[PDB]
Design a binder for this molecule. Structure first.
Ligand SMILES: CCCCCCCCOCCOCCOCCOCCOCCO
Ligand SMILES: CCCCCCCCOCCOCCOCCOCCOCCO
Length: 772
């Protein structure tokens, strides 16, 4: 539908970038093709496809319409053979918006290098959950997304915190709009497991070792969440929802031009959710507001300012698990899926807010620059109280552990980068060069010295959460942890031949953890990034990459000598083939990857047996560890109204002990999510289903009362989702999702501090969405 245009004749480059903006569409073109060319005038309200053919008039250029992207090409009657991965500059530095693409495969992406590249161009495993996927499958928060993300396994620490493994590792790398947060521990990290999907276009997950743009982080993966953006045409929707266990949700999303010309624009969202659960006495209100204003200082300088805010506010939160495995005498406990060992008043509320600003500028060059400022708060308020220990006892009584943690973390980030093309041996290449600084400050209070509490209860079998609330007494501890991260990075992408793209970069890193622990310091650390992509046909490419990452150890991971262990460090080695079809409407990837860890913190038993250095009392050892496996995925259009996303991941990870590690992460996993839009009589109907399988997994947990280690197993299980949607009316639709159709009862945690969590039983969600 028609858009308001005004692009005066100028370099075809500026015109192409000015078009991308005014049209909310991403424009890709080759620098050396548009250089000495100029665009013809376009003026007025217009349909975008008329607009571009009108803009290119006189220029030799053609247009490949590609959903939210158009790519401009200029054909020659020469054409010696084709350069499919030729260097292409790009109007949207985050890549292609997925909203209204109607697809499950992503458009372009810059998760890997800061350079906008398509998944066939990206020489690392990159999986993306697209805006429409989130819509069709009910994926309302990051937990729901991860569960539906190929290669990811979500396991539970407690009601208010989950865990995401990839390739043998706990992911601790989150970004927002490509900006790393600090996530050293749960301190800095409040509400990361919980982000609402309402403010986002999509979450892109880079799996492997992602040091280059993450800086210091964990192995396995980065989860980069991309924010929703304002647009030039007015539009929004209102959505209202209702599912199993008094789970109710509203959501408002509004966006467009805020002045007659269009040079300031805004988008706003609020969503609210209040739900109980299968688990007894658990309930949880979340609120989310977001707001973004875009200003065009002038047509090649844009200033963006905005804020978001989320509060997660639960009741009956548990600390660890849903109930304890063994009782007082050592027998495995057997309890309803509703059992919830947290107190009625127990809360692990976790909150988040961001004030940010960006300036982005286009240089005559066709080079573009961007400055990003972030102020971020992660807060928690956790007066927790639950049953732990080896309970119940023969007489049915049990004991509460109740402690209270409050705190807040304030962050500031500046990031700057410059991106552009450049000629070298008579071919076109691109470079990114960036610098970044983050300072972040955790300040907390703890309470364990409880005045005059009687923490026993007289009925385990009927635990209602109905216990007293203690006198927290005075603070027990005061936290003060300041991290400082600086880094500078560089990648070049050489178009070496018409089939070979060579990727060369690094990041140099400075990292300081200051406060109540002895200082932790790592200076001038270098993180390599070497990769290549060789084209085989119009369809298939092979790629191989070598990527690195490290993370300075927690202060409490010292050795025999009482020396902080050296940074936890990894190299992902990856070789693979990617396939592309139907003009990028469908994508396939088959990969073999390997991970080499070093300094994986490990207890050190011989020593801990009997402390001899009185300096340390419980020392660790840094060992090596190795992850080997392969992965296949597919995403996009299988036929005309028929989308899938599917994956298959295999891994084993062992350490120098030889023994398997991360054994709760299954060794083999599988995801297939599909929907179909009929045509003709039924063309208002959309039908959807999905399955996720994973094989055997387990923990060794120690039955204390019996004085022996036991293995707990979760037998391989399927989970099936079903989905239908009918568009009754132009402006109004009604959906239903049913998850876990066969009501499979399984475990999402066995073994976390000797407890267990059950996965969601069958649940339905009903909703209507209304578009103005
Ligand atoms: C220092 C704090 C920075 C916070 C920035 C937050 C900005 C919040 O502003 C919300 C703007 O949203 C714009 C809503 O867009 C709706 C467009 O419709 C306009 C009215 O339509 C009239 C006839 O169509
Ligand atoms: C352990 C218990 C789980 C129960 C399992 C139930 C699964 C079967 O449910 C089938 C759902 O079909 C009901 C169809 O209702 C249609 C919904 O229409 C939406 C209304 O929108 C109103 C618009 O204003």
């Amino acid at each position: 539908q028609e858009v308001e245009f005004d692009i005066p004749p100028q370099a075809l480059g500026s015109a192409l970038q000015e078009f991308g903006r005014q049209a909310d569409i991403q424009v890709l073109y080759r620098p050396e093709e548009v250089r000495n060319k100029r665009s013809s005038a376009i003026k007025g309200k217009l349909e975008p496809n008329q607009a571009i053919t009108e803009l290119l008039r006189g220029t030799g250029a053609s247009v490949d319409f590609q959903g939210n992207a158009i790519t401009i090409s200029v054909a020659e009657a020469a054409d010696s053979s084709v350069d499919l991965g030729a260097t292409m500059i790009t109007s949207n530095q985050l890549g292609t918006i997925t909203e209204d693409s109607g697809s499950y495969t992503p458009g372009t992406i810059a998760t890997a290098t800061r350079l906008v590249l398509t998944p066939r161009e990206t020489p690392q495993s990159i999986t993306v959950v697209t805006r429409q996927n989130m819509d069709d499958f009910g994926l309302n928060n990051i937990d729901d997304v991860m569960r539906h993300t190929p290669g990811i396994t979500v396991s539970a620490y407690d009601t208010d915190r989950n865990n995401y493994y990839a390739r043998g590792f706990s992911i601790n790398n989150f970004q927002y709009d490509g900006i790393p947060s600090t996530a050293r521990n749960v301190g800095y990290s409040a509400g990361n497991t919980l982000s609402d999907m309402a403010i986002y276009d999509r979450v892109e997950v880079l799996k492997g070792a992602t040091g280059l743009l993450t800086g210091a982080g964990s192995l396995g993966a980065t989860i980069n969440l991309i924010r929703k953006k304002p647009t030039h045409e007015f539009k929004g929707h209102v959505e209202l929802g209702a599912g199993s266990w008094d789970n109710y949700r509203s959501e408002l999303d509004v966006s467009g031009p805020l002045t007659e010309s269009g040079n300031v624009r805004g988008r706003a969202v609020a969503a609210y959710q209040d739900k109980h659960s299968f688990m007894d006495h658990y309930e949880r209100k979340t609120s989310v507001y977001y707001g973004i204003l875009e200003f065009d200082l002038n047509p090649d300088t844009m200033l963006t300012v905005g804020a978001d805010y989320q509060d997660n506010d639960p009741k009956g939160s548990g600390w660890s698990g849903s109930f304890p495995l063994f009782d007082s005498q050592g027998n495995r406990n057997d309890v309803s899926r509703s059992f919830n060992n947290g107190a009625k008043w127990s809360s692990w509320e976790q909150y988040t807010r961001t004030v940010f600003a960006n300036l982005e500028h286009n240089f005559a060059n066709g080079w573009v620059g961007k400055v990003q400022l972030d102020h971020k708060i992660n807060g928690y308020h956790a007066p927790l109280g639950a049953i732990m220990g080896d309970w119940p006892a023969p007489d049915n009584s049990a004991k509460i552990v109740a402690q209270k943690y409050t705190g807040e973390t304030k962050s500031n980030s500046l990031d700057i980068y410059l991106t552009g093309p450049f000629q070298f041996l008579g071919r076109e290449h691109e470079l990114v060069v960036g610098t970044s600084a983050s300072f972040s400050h955790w300040e907390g209070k703890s309470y364990w010295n409880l005045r005059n509490y009687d923490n026993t209860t007289d009925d385990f079998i009927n635990w209602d959460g109905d216990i007293g609330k203690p006198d927290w007494g005075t603070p027990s501890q005061y936290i003060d942890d300041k991290t400082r991260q600086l880094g500078s990075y560089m990648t070049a992408r050489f178009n070496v031949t018409d089939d070979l793209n060579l990727f060369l970069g690094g990041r140099v890193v400075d990292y300081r953890v200051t406060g109540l622990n002895p200082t932790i310091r790592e200076s001038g650390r270098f993180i390599p990034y070497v990769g290549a992509v060789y084209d085989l046909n119009d369809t298939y490419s092979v790629y191989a990459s070598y990527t690195d990452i490290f993370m300075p150890q927690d202060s409490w991971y010292r050795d025999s000598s009482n020396k902080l262990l050296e940074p936890d460090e990894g190299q992902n080695y990856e070789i693979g083939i990617k396939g592309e079809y139907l003009d990028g409407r469908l994508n396939t990837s088959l990969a073999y990857f390997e991970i080499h860890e070093e300094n994986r913190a490990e207890e050190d038993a011989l020593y801990n047996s009997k402390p001899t250095n009185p300096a340390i009392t419980y020392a660790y050892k840094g060992i090596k560890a190795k992850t080997k496996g392969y992965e296949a995925e597919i995403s996009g259009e299988l036929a005309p109204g028929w989308q899938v996303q599917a994956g298959y991941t295999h891994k084993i990870i062992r350490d120098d002990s030889g023994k398997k590690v991360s054994t709760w992460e299954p060794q083999d996993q599988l995801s297939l999510y599909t929907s179909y839009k009929f045509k003709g009589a039924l063309d208002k109907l959309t039908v959807g289903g999905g399955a996720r399988w994973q094989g055997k997994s387990w923990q060794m947990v120690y039955n204390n009362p019996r004085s022996r280690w036991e293995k707990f197993s979760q037998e391989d299980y399927w989970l099936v989702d079903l989905m239908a949607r009918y568009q009754i009316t132009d402006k109004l639709s009604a959906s239903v999702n049913v998850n876990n159709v066969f009501d499979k009862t399984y475990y999402t945690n066995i073994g976390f501090y000797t407890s267990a969590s059950y996965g969601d039983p069958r649940n339905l969600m009903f909703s209507t969405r209304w578009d103005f």
